[PDB]
């Protein structure tokens, strides 16, 4: 339909993808580093979620260079997405209420 509305949803599908590839890539990068805890897929997915939302509790975090780079991408994707939905809600509210005048 509307650009902003489409870009938002596209941002959401893209998010889910980054979340999954994030889980895969994180484990791939962290495994091999002594003491690393981001080493099994199920928890790595939960790590990805709390990173993308930025709640970073943490209970798990990358410690290798590539794990951190993967973390940086997930952070930005999550922030961009959640930020692309706010702009879509602002476009909807503005354009709309503009009629209520």
């Amino acid at each position, epitope marked *: 339909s509307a650009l902003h509305w489409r870009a938002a949803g596209a941002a959401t599908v893209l998010l889910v993808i980054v979340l999954l590839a994030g889980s*895969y890539l994180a484990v791939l990068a962290e495994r091999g580093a002594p003491g690393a805890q981001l080493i099994t897929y199920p928890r790595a997915l939960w790590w990805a979620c709390e990173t993308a939302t930025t709640v970073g509790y943490x209970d798990l975090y990358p410690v290798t260079l590539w794990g951190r780079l993967v973390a940086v991408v997930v952070m930005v994707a999550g922030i961009t997405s959640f930020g692309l939905v706010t702009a879509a809600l602002a476009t909807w509210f503005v354009g709309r209420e503009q009629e209520r005048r």
Partner: antibody, heavy 118, light 106 residues
Framework: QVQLQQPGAELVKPGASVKLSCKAS????????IHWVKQRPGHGLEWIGE????????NYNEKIQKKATLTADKSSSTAFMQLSSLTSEDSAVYYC???????????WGAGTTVTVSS | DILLTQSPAILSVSPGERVSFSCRAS??????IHWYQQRTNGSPRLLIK???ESISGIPSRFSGSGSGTDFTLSINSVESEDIANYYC?????????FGSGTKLEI
């Protein structure tokens, strides 16, 4: 159907080299890691290393000399471990096991008995 | 590298009794512990995963408990087929590691 198939035994002369194999069956996912565990007679289990076939990357135990090199062949679904410059010390039973990226070893191979003698 | 300690190394029990093996982690690992069985001339067999979760195809006789650094694998009423070597393994931190082992004797 036996999930992992390994040659029953291998003989190697000191200083020589042998390449063990492990053919897998059943379901196969991108999240599969194949591990190699070494067991000397009368003793316990010793993690040697791991490899992720879908990507081809492997990691090895730092607390021990690196006699092994891991490789994988996607087409024939076989994982190989190249043991080099052996000695009586490298003589034991080598297992391969599969892990679904969740931390435990679901299934093991029968194990390949390796002997280093002249 | 997490050090898993299993003591004692040999456990002797009377038929039908209740036996308990213990694993001691050198640092908190949650419940990221798993147990294996290896009979003579055999290969390891997963018995319990994640400290408590039961595996399919394993007698309801086998159970596990613990969290942090202290874990226990129990057998309610042990029997002959249980004579073997039990090992624990952690997946909390890299690299995975194995316990020294415990032999069950009747």
């Amino acid at each position: 159907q036996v999930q992992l198939q390994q040659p029953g035994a291998e003989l190697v002369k000191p200083g020589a080299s042998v390449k063990l194999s492990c053919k897998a069956s059943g379901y196969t996912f991108t999240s599969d890691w194949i591990h190699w565990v070494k067991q000397r007679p009368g003793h316990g289990l010793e993690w040697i290393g791991e490899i992720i076939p879908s990507y081809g990357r492997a990691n090895y135990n730092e607390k021990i000399q690196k006699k092994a090199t891991l490789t994988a062949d996607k087409s024939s679904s076989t994982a190989f471990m190249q043991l080099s410059s052996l000695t009586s010390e490298d003589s034991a039973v080598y297992y391969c096991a599969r892990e679904r990226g969740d931390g435990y070893f679901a299934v093991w191979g029968a194990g390949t008995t390796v002997t280093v003698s002249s | 590298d997490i050090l898993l300690t299993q003591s004692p190394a040999i456990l002797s029990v009377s038929p039908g009794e209740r036996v308990s093996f213990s694993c001691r982690a050198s640092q908190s690992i949650g419940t990221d512990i798993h147990w294996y069985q290896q009979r003579t001339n055999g290969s390891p067999r997963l018995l319990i995963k994640y400290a408590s979760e039961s595996i399919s195809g394993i007698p309801s006789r086998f159970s596990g408990s613990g969290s942090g650094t202290d874990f226990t694998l129990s057998i309610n009423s042990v029997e002959s087929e249980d004579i073997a070597n039990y090992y624990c393994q952690q997946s909390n931190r890299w690299p995975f590691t194995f316990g020294s082992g415990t032999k069950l004797e009747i």
